[PDB]
Amino acid sequence: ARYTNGHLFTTISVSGMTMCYACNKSITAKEALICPTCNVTIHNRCKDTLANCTKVKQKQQK
Amino acid sequence: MREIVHIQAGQCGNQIGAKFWEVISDEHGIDPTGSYHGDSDLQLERINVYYNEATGNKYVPRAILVDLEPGTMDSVRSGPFGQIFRPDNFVFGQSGAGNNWAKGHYTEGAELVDSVLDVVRKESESCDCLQGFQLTHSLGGGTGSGMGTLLISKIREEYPDRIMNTFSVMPSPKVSDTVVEPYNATLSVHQLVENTDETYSIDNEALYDICFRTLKLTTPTYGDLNHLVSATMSGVTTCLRFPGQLNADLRKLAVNMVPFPRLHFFMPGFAPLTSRGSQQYRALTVPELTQQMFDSKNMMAACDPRHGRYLTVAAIFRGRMSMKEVDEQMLNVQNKNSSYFVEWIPNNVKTAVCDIPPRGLKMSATFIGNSTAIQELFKRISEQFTAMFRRKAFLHWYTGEGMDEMEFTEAESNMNDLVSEYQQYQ
Amino acid sequence: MREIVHIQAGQCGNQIGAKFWEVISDEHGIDPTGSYHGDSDLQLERINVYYNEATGNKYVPRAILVDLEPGTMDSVRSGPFGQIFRPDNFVFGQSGAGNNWAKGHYTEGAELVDSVLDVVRKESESCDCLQGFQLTHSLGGGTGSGMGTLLISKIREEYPDRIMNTFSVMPSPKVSDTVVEPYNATLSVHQLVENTDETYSIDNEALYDICFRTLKLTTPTYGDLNHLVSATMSGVTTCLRFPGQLNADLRKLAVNMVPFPRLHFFMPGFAPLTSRGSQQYRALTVPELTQQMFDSKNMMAACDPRHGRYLTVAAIFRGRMSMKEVDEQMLNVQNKNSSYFVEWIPNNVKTAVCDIPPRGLKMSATFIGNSTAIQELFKRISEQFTAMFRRKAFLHWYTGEGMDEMEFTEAESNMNDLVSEYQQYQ
Amino acid sequence: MRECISIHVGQAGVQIGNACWELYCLEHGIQPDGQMPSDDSFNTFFSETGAGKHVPRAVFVDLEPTVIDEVRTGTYRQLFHPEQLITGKEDAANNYARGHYTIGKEIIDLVLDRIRKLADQCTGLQGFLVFHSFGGGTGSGFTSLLMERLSVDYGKKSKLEFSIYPAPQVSTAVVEPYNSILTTHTTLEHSDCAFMVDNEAIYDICRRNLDIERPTYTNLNRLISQIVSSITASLRFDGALNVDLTEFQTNLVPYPRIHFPLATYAPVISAEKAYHEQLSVAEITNACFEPANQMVKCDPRHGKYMACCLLYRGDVVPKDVNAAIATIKTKRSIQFVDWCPTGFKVGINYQPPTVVPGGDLAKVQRAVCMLSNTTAIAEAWARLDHKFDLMYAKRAFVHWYVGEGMEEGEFSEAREDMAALEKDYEEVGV
Amino acid sequence: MRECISIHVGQAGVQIGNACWELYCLEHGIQPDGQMPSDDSFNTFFSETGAGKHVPRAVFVDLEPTVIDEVRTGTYRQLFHPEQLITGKEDAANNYARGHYTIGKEIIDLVLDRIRKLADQCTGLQGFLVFHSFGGGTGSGFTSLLMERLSVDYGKKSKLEFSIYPAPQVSTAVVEPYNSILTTHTTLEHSDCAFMVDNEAIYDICRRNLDIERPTYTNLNRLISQIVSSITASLRFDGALNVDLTEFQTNLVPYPRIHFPLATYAPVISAEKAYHEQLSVAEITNACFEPANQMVKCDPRHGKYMACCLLYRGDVVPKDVNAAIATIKTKRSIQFVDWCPTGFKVGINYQPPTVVPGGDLAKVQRAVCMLSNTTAIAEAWARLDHKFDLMYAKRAFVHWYVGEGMEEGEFSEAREDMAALEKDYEEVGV
Ligand SMILES: CC(=O)O[C@H]1C(=O)[C@@]2(C)[C@H]([C@H](OC(=O)c3ccccc3)[C@]3(O)C[C@H](OC(=O)[C@H](O)[C@@H](NC(=O)c4ccccc4)c4ccccc4)C(C)=C1C3(C)C)[C@]1(OC(C)=O)CO[C@@H]1C[C@@H]2O
């Protein structure tokens, strides 16, 4: 299906104060991606810039 | 005197037959009620060809309406001309064919077929001198593609000597309105190549092509396509319903145009066809009718005749014209297009002329052509079938009705045999 | 007999053709609705030269109307005489030439050339004995300069023996309405010199000069220029539409007027021309018509003939006039003006006399001159071309469509060759 | 003639039916209390009594009384036959084992009795329209229990289903994966064509197109009712290409087990937006193939279309359907499998879509309902089984199931079966 | 047939469009609500919907909601399609990086969808009419983002672009040179005809001819709208010499990159002045060529004319036109390049100019719009890059750009690229 860096990205309805996982900026639109394993959210414009799933999820476990 | 039995099968066949009854009742001056109201005696002279006389000077068509759903029967009976048929002739079940060839041929309408032949027998026995049968159906779907062919087989078994003349709307790739059309077509033409003596192959793509590029209709419905098909249907039987300079029975057409037994798949056409906005500018004389009649755009099948050569061709003119003129044009077309005709037949053109043109027209010309290019229609369907049958897709629905894959293989084998035969002489 | 197939291409060609049809329909007494309403039988005697007969005694022009924008076709169709044309020959695209010759010849017009040639085939087949083709176009812009030459090449290939006779409005320096006119003219004349047998040069500058100094129009529009061009357009074909003392077919014109194969570019003219306030003062007699006809101002090309000499002259008189008088005048003109005629042709003047003058006139005289002075028109455009091609200005638009600078070089080579041929005899 | 039996199970199914029969009554001009002021167009869904009363051909069942107590008291109290509104005593409590083995056991014999009585009034019965939810306790257990009997008593009759399927992120229960995983055996063995539907997809559709920021469940029901009405329009009305209910399955289903098509409807549009565009046949046809308009949260671009049925209704000319399908075919984004060169079934009906007077959906002269058997829906299952695997690894909530008469192994046997189904949709994708 | 898509970006572009669509609606007689009380003259700019409503073929985009919110509340609320009026969340803040890389990247996929749906309606599309400002953040970044996408999606179609350009003295922002120098890549590589205009020249025009001492931006927009209406007049109306949109470029553009003509209009005059003077063809033709009437503050005498397009509209005859250009050649002030001895493209249209009722422009029987590719515009670049060089020497404002995903080196590559363009405009001048 989709493994650009190595995980799923499915649409989520985004609200309130949020931040990209790569830009570390704020998302303005009401759309966002989300990996159910990595538990992140991105602009829809930084999908290829992230690391692979293994990197991000092993990072998330600090 | 050369009486014809009329049958319908499936939704397409029923609709086109209804429009055919429209056209020919208009020609004969028959009221919607069945009362005669025409102008000339020549309308009444051969009225027996299509209609049985009934008391009160009523006329009832010799039509057998067969369909496995009640919906289309209710549609025709509530139509502009539904009251004209005989109530006894509506033979129909309840459960639809489900676009399944096996359902029609073996399981569901195999019950209804016994009722159908008994009515057809009554109509045939009521006639003085039966000439042939004329059937309308469609090769897609399951109602037409199975029931029409089973009925063809039974009537052929009972009436081996009478002519059989079926009109067949059959699929095209870009105008496909059903997923399983290749299976149904390959199963139905496997019989049509055997039993029928003539088969008038029709195609929605060519009908829409004429509706757009020639008629310039903005929104053509199926009604206009049925009108176009019924035009040729009325044209071909013209020689045995009116006087003429050259009379040609359906048997005469078959004798001239069918060289070998199995190359009997026909390509029809019509002239004149004009857009309304341009009819005032055209001249309807013999030369331009002849030009338009042989145009590649004017034929009712998607196959371009320029990809093949004609075995034989028939021109049924109607109107008042010079015989010398018609002969000269039919020589000129065959001479200047000599590359597009088989040269092992010295003369490919057959001409007939009747004196009664269609109403509102001063002249008309119905075209029929037996061309090798028709193989492109028959190749393509097989090429579609090979896409599905190689992985047995959708086969459980057919095998649930007792059908076997060996019959599918044999049907495709007969397909490749027929297309090879058409290719051999090209 | 002697039918002419006429074609329109580009905005200017379409406009001049539209006026030309109105003028001749006035001559033949054809109503805007296409119904005949004329007085004399001589109008109907040779109606077939330009018009096909249609049912109800209507007459449709044998015109092929071609363009790459629908705007001109919308303008013509809603024009004074738009309804007369047959809708089928309105062949047109959607994206225009963009004043690009390569767009006309290779990319956009190459797709429509098949469509126009098909209709030209129908019109030519309807003819009994076709004589030649009669194309109206302009050498500026992209539609005319490209598509007219492409179609000329095609028709020349399919009809090598029939006359190709074109009328060309072509650039001038002080009345230029497009930056890229030199390129387009250089590319177009490279085809016209090879294919056409008669090309009638026309200049907007000279037409404005006629309007101002001779007609004394205060505000001459393009309609007046089209009127002036249409006058000679009708004049040249008069001998094959009306009887006369000396009948000169366009082939007979070509034989006398083209001493050598490529020197066929002609300068037209018309007489009488007077201001509407002074026509009461003139005497129209043949000597005065002759004097105005040979005046340098009277010719519709900017080339003043006094910087050159005449190879051949053709005077197509119309009306009832004295043959001895015409011969006397045409002898005295070439004798007293001997320095401006080539002495190696013993007689430089062809004369034809039709018995029917234009409507409203008692006598008329159409003028054709094959003169070396036309080289000035052929050498000025080249000096414009050499100005731009030396720095490759605007060539990216052309080379984007697959064109090459090599074809530009060959076109300019052929142009200087033609100028050299015209100069070699002066 | 051409009748259909509409069984509604679970709260979701019952409320969807409450919307659906509301839509039908407006369609055929029947009053909410069952009379008809002034064709047999209603004969498919309504049986007619001598008093001029049209009783629906429906059976409402729920093991708790609340929702059917509402319908028995609402405006449509007089529409339904009183004894086809069947209620139990104990709520299923979101447990497949209760709905199938213990509490749904008692009420099944009455439900099949009423279905038999409805069937005996039919002359030309065609199939079943079952409405239920995958997550619900009654919506899984009772539908399995009922279908196991229906497949043996009326085996030949086709069986059409309309299911609400668990979403990626939206979820209203914790054991939804178990309940769906147990409903899979029913939907595999004793079904013929079932339509998945997702709440979040319709939520996003209503947010984007209808411009409502926060809809309730009634909005979702008023679109699912529109879809089922579009399916049955060919059966209740005349048309250019009327599609039979068995023809429908013969086109949709390539293989015996591959019968889980997506469904979508167009033009889903508000009343204010509709005035500023034309809604031609080409536009609405292109609308169905966007991911923005699918009713299941899955990208069609990640799979291959296998079979698409386009049911046009209203002022649609077949020229336009032909031109639209050709335009769809030339696109390289919409990818079909190699072994189905035909692809598209087309039906055209002359009845325009009816707008519910209190509804939001605009009035339009045309509508197209697109149903697509496609491989992308496999990713929708690859989601949900992965939700199961984490829980059953711990034997998380199993004791409630096993405690109510369920065998433990049925869990594993369920998880195996979907592993065969999810395989097959990939296996045919080559 | 013969359609054009009008995209308006930035505050300046949006307000110019508000003037332009006000000028078109009155010219074709369309009411502000989109109806037409009573010939396909409007077909180029308006799409016609079956209710008898004309919707303009336009896309309004601004990354801050303010200006388009005014458009959505003003008199033209009912004219535009509500969804093609696109608004973002955050203002670009006069920053090329924010418009191009950061914020506009979210809305580009929506504006392209709008443009695609507009194009799918168009049967005979020709090109694009992009209106924007060089000084603005959106008007520089978003146009750069959008033109690159259009040049790959619709590479064959023309792209006409309309611009407000920084002036010598008048200016409203500090980093206008940065935004302009960054926009220069977009204009060079993905455009075919960009029309420069500046505020100061039109201000001086209104001071001298229109006799208004202190006008607003609306007065300038009511002249820019007149210029574009004159350009499209040959397309929307019949004429003696109709100039096609591609023919226009073929006469304007001599080299691939020299595509920045000046624009000017005549007779710009007040209602009081016109009664005292005739305004024949010759005088308006002369009126185009003085330095006073240029819309960019440069002296044409300093640069050689390369190509001129005179679009006359109204009661004009070709005789007078040819007479006037004869004199314009006869001058020693209206100089030209040696390698273009034709020079003048001429178009003539029969429709007189339309006067807006509240405008301060007089009614006149004749009008002429002169659009001139000339070398003098190079001086205008020689100005603005010198404004860049002083600031970039200190890295004066750079940290804002680099903070939003912009590479530093792209500044130098921009300054490099303009050094090639100003060279080219000089290199052809010999
Ligand atoms: C003044 C005039 O020219 O009227 C014509 C006409 O305009 C044209 C365009 C007619 C017209 O046909 C159509 O518009 C048409 C549309 C869709 C499909 C088929 C036809 C006409 O309707 C058709 C009609 O034809 C007939 O009446 C024939 O007898 C035909 N029967 C019927 O059409 C018919 C209609 C209603 C009920 C029953 C029959 C027929 C054809 C074949 C064999 C036997 C009979 C005619 C003369 C005309 C009109 C009325 C405009 C054309 O039809 C025929 C069959 O001649 C279409 O091109 C031809 C050429 C004609 O010029």
Ligand SMILES: CC(=O)O[C@H]1C(=O)[C@@]2(C)[C@H]([C@H](OC(=O)c3ccccc3)[C@]3(O)C[C@H](OC(=O)[C@H](O)[C@@H](NC(=O)c4ccccc4)c4ccccc4)C(C)=C1C3(C)C)[C@]1(OC(C)=O)CO[C@@H]1C[C@@H]2O
């Ligand atoms: C009383 C009288 O002398 O009337 C003349 C006339 O005054 C003059 C000035 C006419 C007149 O022509 C013009 O004023 C004119 C203006 C602009 C462009 C061209 C012509 C006349 O309009 C032109 C018109 O000519 C014709 O009718 C010819 O047959 C001509 N056909 C048309 O002009 C025509 C107009 C509208 C529609 C259709 C045809 C023709 C020419 C060559 C070949 C075939 C036909 C005539 C009799 C006159 C008027 C009316 C004043 C002249 O025209 C011709 C061709 O004869 C212009 O100089 C000549 C000499 C005439 O004396």
Ligand SMILES: Nc1nc2c(ncn2[C@@H]2O[C@H](COP(=O)(O)OP(=O)(O)OP(=O)(O)O)[C@@H](O)[C@H]2O)c(=O)[nH]1
């Ligand atoms: N679209 C829609 N979904 C509903 C509605 N009501 C319930 N659901 C869905 O149904 C799912 C839960 O199933 P249940 O409500 O438990 O169905 P049930 O058969 O009553 O289950 P039990 O109460 O345990 O018997 C959830 O995904 C709900 O979103 C409704 O009115 N509209």
Ligand SMILES: Nc1nc2c(ncn2[C@@H]2O[C@H](COP(=O)(O)OP(=O)(O)OP(=O)(O)O)[C@@H](O)[C@H]2O)c(=O)[nH]1
């Ligand atoms: N003629 C005219 N010029 C305007 C108008 N509005 C703004 N401008 C000019 O446009 C230039 C500034 O551009 P901006 O207004 O910042 O464009 P922008 O895209 O909205 O800027 P951002 O908000 O940062 O995206 C200045 O030279 C202004 O003079 C107007 O209404 N008419």
Ligand SMILES: Nc1nc2c(ncn2[C@@H]2O[C@H](COP(=O)(O)OP(=O)(O)O)[C@@H](O)[C@H]2O)c(=O)[nH]1
């Ligand atoms: N010319 C014409 N073609 C039709 C008509 N109705 C259906 N068709 C076409 O013919 C084919 C016949 O299929 P169909 O009759 O529905 O299946 P069946 O009833 O089981 O035989 C359809 O797929 C359509 O493509 C009609 O009324 N006129």
Ligand SMILES: Nc1nc2c(ncn2[C@@H]2O[C@H](COP(=O)(O)OP(=O)(O)O)[C@@H](O)[C@H]2O)c(=O)[nH]1
């Ligand atoms: N006599 C006359 N000349 C015209 C007319 N229209 C245009 N012209 C001139 O002829 C030339 C033809 O150019 P044009 O046809 O517009 O370009 P094209 O459409 O690409 O062939 C113009 O440059 C004008 O100088 C007209 O109506 N009558």
Ligand SMILES: [Mg+2]
């Ligand atoms: Mg419940």
Ligand SMILES: [Mg+2]
């Ligand atoms: Mg702004």
Ligand SMILES: [Zn+2]
């Ligand atoms: Zn980001």
Ligand SMILES: [Zn+2]
């Ligand atoms: Zn991940």
